[PDB]
Design an enzyme around this catalytic site. Structure first.
Site, mmCIF file in Angstrom:
data_model
loop_
_atom_site.group_PDB
_atom_site.id
_atom_site.type_symbol
_atom_site.label_atom_id
_atom_site.label_comp_id
_atom_site.label_asym_id
_atom_site.label_seq_id
_atom_site.Cartn_x
_atom_site.Cartn_y
_atom_site.Cartn_z
ATOM 1 N N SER A 1 0.881 -1.133 0.000
ATOM 2 C CA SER A 1 0.000 0.000 0.000
ATOM 3 C C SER A 1 0.908 1.168 0.000
ATOM 4 O O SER A 1 1.849 1.201 0.785
ATOM 5 N N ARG A 2 0.634 2.186 -0.841
ATOM 6 C CA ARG A 2 1.482 3.350 -0.904
ATOM 7 C C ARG A 2 0.881 4.452 -0.083
ATOM 8 O O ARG A 2 1.492 5.502 0.086
ATOM 9 N N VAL A 3 -0.306 4.215 0.505
ATOM 10 C CA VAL A 3 -0.926 5.135 1.414
ATOM 11 C C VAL A 3 -0.823 4.425 2.719
ATOM 12 O O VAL A 3 -0.369 4.999 3.704
#
Lengths: 50, 56, 499, 62
Positions: free
Chosen positions: C366-368
């Site tokens: 997940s980049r968030v």
């Protein structure tokens, strides 16, 4: 309830084919002639409103 | 509560651990627990006796 | 009466006014009517044929306007009047679409009567800019322990559900929808994600299953199912996510939260391919239309966590991509992977090895991510990430003379893997996620036998509920684990382990 | 015009299509009553069992 709903759909379809029979009756009548006049005068009113 | 009956039951299973020559007393108790648990799920499964006639 | 309803319907027909632009079909082949007329046509405008078929006008050519029929070719025929509806593709948007299974046109395909809607908004509306957004800061719990901890899901953000074909991809998604019931039940609009499931190319049999499961879990009352079934034609299939997005935008515009699940863009891709190739538009890579990158990018950028000036709202999204032989290399996967911000990669081997959800932790990112993780859940699962990472490395060491350290990793790792199994279509509340993971973190589960892990789990939960549902209520409401709670929790786990 | 013609023709010449309640009965499951109120049998009635049990298991508790 299930059959009641099914019967309603069946009645609607019975009346649908009866509508086709009425359409054929209408296209038989010289209402077929008389309504062309109705369309004509209605269009005169429409096209004049343009 | 039902928990009083069941607490005394399982405590007694573990008391029955501390007495031998009573190797199937606890199995009867287990059956009593089973059917006790059965009647509550029987009761939760319930369809109320009356037909629906307000809506249905 | 059957007569009365029909009578109302006939009565509801009456008169008309000038048909602004007629057309006459020149040639109709392949659902590509090429029409002579429609001089003042707007781009992608909705046009109505004699047959009543609706179309869009993707090509506005220098003398013919290439309508694309939304309907079957059978009904349209050459020389047909092509009335100009004069309204660019727009779909009703409003609040009434909740609990309404509608097709792309907005016609209830479940016959739940005329749509109650507050606007009809175009489906080509362009996304909110740089400054109209404010960074993600609101979790969305999916009720899947692994998703919530290993790859935490925020709001307005997008992450793939990219994985192998028919691994019940829809099941992983559907679970999220179910968990939204808990938050939904609450009155706070903060706690209200109005989910939209966008069934693209999905067989009607599948949609029947979808409908029943959603009804069964009472989910319809915050659900919308935009349905473009397999039968539904390539214009509908093309415009189906676009249409869906517009519905989401209305919620987003009201500043509420919602989750729109596009499943699967792979069938969207195929539809664009069909349109372009049939319209003779330049072909491109992997025989997917040249502008397929542009299509996917347009859709996926609509999802946004709005700014406070725009009264912070969101439109969380979860695109689903079906990998063909697990090829992330493939052109449609590569494009989408680039566009999205995180991926969850379900893996068939894991599914076979009985891990369900079959999410492959390694290939999930997940980049968030942890930015929108519950604080409590963050605390009790930093350790978890590292342990699993080690378990992966020490995985191959599972073939004898094994170091004590490696063996320690193996015991802890195997138990964790077993713990993260979940029975699909049962979501698990965060207040019950937090205890289970705490135990694993404190390694008290290491002692518990592998076979007994499943039994342990439910027992621990019931034990916690009996022992102290005060703690649970505190966990739920405070949302931040105090030292006293972490103390009590450790004790509780120890006590539970003892029984 | 044509609307009126159809409206008139349709409504008048057959409002409803025939239907019969009797025919419906065949195609739907009929109500049928549960059989027996039932009474549970008297479980382990009397000391026949007890006298048997005391003798049968005179087993002590060690």
């Amino acid at each position: 309830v299930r059959y009641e709903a099914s019967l309603r759909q069946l009645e609607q379809r019975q009346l649908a084919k009866s509508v086709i029979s009425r359409v054929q009756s209408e296209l038989g009548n010289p209402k077929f002639q008389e309504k062309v006049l109705q369309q004509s005068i209605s269009e005169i009113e429409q096209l004049l409103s343009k | 509560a039902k928990s009083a009956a069941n607490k005394l039951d399982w405590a007694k299973v573990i008391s029955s651990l501390r007495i031998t020559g009573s190797t199937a007393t606890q199995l009867s108790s287990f059956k009593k627990r089973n059917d006790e648990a059965r009647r509550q799920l029987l009761e939760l499964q319930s369809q109320p006796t009356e037909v629906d006639f307000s809506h249905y | 009466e059957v007569s009365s309803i029909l009578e109302e319907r006939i009565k509801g027909v009456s008169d008309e006014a000038n048909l602004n632009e007629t057309g006459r079909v020149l040639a109709v082949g392949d659902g590509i009517a090429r029409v002579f007329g429609l001089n003042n046509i707007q781009a992608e405008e909705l046009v109505e044929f004699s047959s009543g078929v609706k179309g869009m006008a993707l090509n506005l050519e220098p003398g013919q306007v290439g309508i694309v029929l939304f309907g079957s070719d059978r009904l349209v025929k050459e020389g047909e009047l092509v009335k100009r509806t004069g309204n660019i593709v727009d779909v009703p948007v409003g609040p009434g679409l909740l609990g309404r299974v509608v097709d792309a046109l907005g016609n209830p395909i479940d016959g739940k009567g005329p749509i109650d809607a507050a606007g009809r908004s175009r489906a080509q509306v362009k996304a909110p800019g740089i400054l109209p957004r404010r960074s993600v800061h609101e979790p969305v719990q999916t009720g899947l322990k692994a998703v919530d901890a290993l790859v935490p899901i925020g709001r307005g953000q997008r992450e793939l559900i990219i994985g192998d074909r028919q691994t019940g991809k829809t099941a992983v998604a559907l679970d999220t929808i179910l968990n939204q019931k808990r938050w939904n039940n609450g009155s706070d609009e903060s706690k209200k994600l109005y989910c939209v499931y966008v069934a693209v190319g999905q067989k009607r049999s599948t949609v029947a299953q979808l409908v029943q499961t959603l009804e069964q879990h009472d989910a319809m009352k915050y659900s919308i199912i935009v349905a473009a079934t397999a039968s539904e034609a390539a214009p509908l299939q093309y415009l189906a996510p676009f249409t869906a997005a517009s519905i989401g935008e209305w919620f987003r515009d009201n500043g509420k939260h919602a989750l729109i699940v596009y499943d699967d863009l792979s069938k969207q891709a195929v539809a664009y391919r069909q349109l372009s190739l049939l319209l003779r538009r330049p072909p491109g890579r992997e025989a997917y239309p040249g502008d397929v990158f542009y299509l996917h990018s347009r859709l996926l950028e609509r999802a946004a966590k709005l700014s406070e000036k725009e009264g912070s709202g969101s439109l969380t999204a979860l695109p689903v991509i079906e990998t063909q032989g697990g090829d992330v290399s493939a052109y449609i996967p590569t494009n989408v992977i680039s566009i999205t911000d995180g991926q969850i990669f379900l893996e068939a081997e894991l599914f076979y090895k009985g891990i369900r959800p079959a999410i492959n932790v390694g290939l999930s990112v997940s980049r968030v991510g942890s930015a929108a993780q519950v604080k409590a859940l963050k605390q009790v699962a930093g350790s978890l990430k590292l342990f699993l990472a080690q378990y992966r490395e020490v995985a191959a060491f599972a073939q004898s003379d094994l170091d004590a350290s490696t063996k320690q990793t193996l015991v802890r790792g195997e138990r964790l893997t077993q713990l993260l199994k979940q029975n699909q279509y049962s979501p698990l509340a965060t207040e019950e996620q937090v205890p289970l993971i705490y135990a694993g973190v404190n390694g008290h589960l290491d002692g518990i036998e592998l076979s007994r892990i499943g039994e342990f789990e439910s027992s621990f939960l019931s034990y916690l509920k009996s022992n102290h549902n005060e703690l649970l209520t505190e966990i739920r409401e405070k949302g931040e684990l105090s030292k006293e709670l972490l103390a009590s929790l450790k004790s509780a786990t120890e006590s539970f382990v003892a029984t | 015009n044509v609307i009126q013609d159809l409206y008139l023709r349709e409504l008048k010449d057959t409002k409803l299509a025939p239907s019969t309640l009797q025919d419906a009965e065949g195609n739907v499951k009929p109500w049928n009553p549960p059989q027996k109120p039932n009474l549970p049998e008297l479980e382990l009635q009397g000391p026949e069992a007890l006298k048997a049990y005391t003798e049968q298991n005179v087993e002590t508790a060690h």
